[PDB]
Amino acid sequence: NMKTVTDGREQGVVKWNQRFSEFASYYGFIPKVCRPYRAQTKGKVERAIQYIMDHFYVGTAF
DNA sequence: CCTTCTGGGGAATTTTAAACCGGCGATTTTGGGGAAAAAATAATCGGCCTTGACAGCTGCACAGTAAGAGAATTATGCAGTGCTGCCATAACCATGAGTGATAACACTGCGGCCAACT
């Protein structure tokens, strides 16, 4: 639930940001939002974040 | 009435069984050397089992003590100036010794001149 993709739960239903909704309709992909304060529903990407931040960005210097 | 037979006992002798001690023949044991095998120890390999973390981030508040940073104040050491006295150095002359110089020959460095290529 990022404000760059939504604008709050209008009584349970989600209100999509108009510009982002236009962007999604342009590329055709349907957006979805998991839920407030529940990151389990997107465990794949969070675990990938753990993977990258404990494998790549641990000692690499730039 | 007498003679002969037999039996018991003490002494001498012989044989066989048992036990010890020694000698002789055999196996065992100890030591050293060489080879082979087993096991022990360490290191390296693969893989299974299980769980932590990834989910915005951490800066601030209070407690006490100590340190330190900045500014004002104070102490002290350097410097400056005047007057007098003492020590150093410098100036001259003489004599000895060292080095810079001068002559001569030989080798090398630099400038003037000639030629070859583009």
UniProtKB/Swiss-Prot annotation:
Describe its function. Involved in the transposition of the insertion sequence.
Q: Which family does it belong to?
A: Belongs to the transposase IS21/IS408/IS1162 family.
Q: What is this protein called?
A: Putative transposase for insertion sequence element IS5376
Please name the source species.
Geobacillus stearothermophilus (Bacillus stearothermophilus)
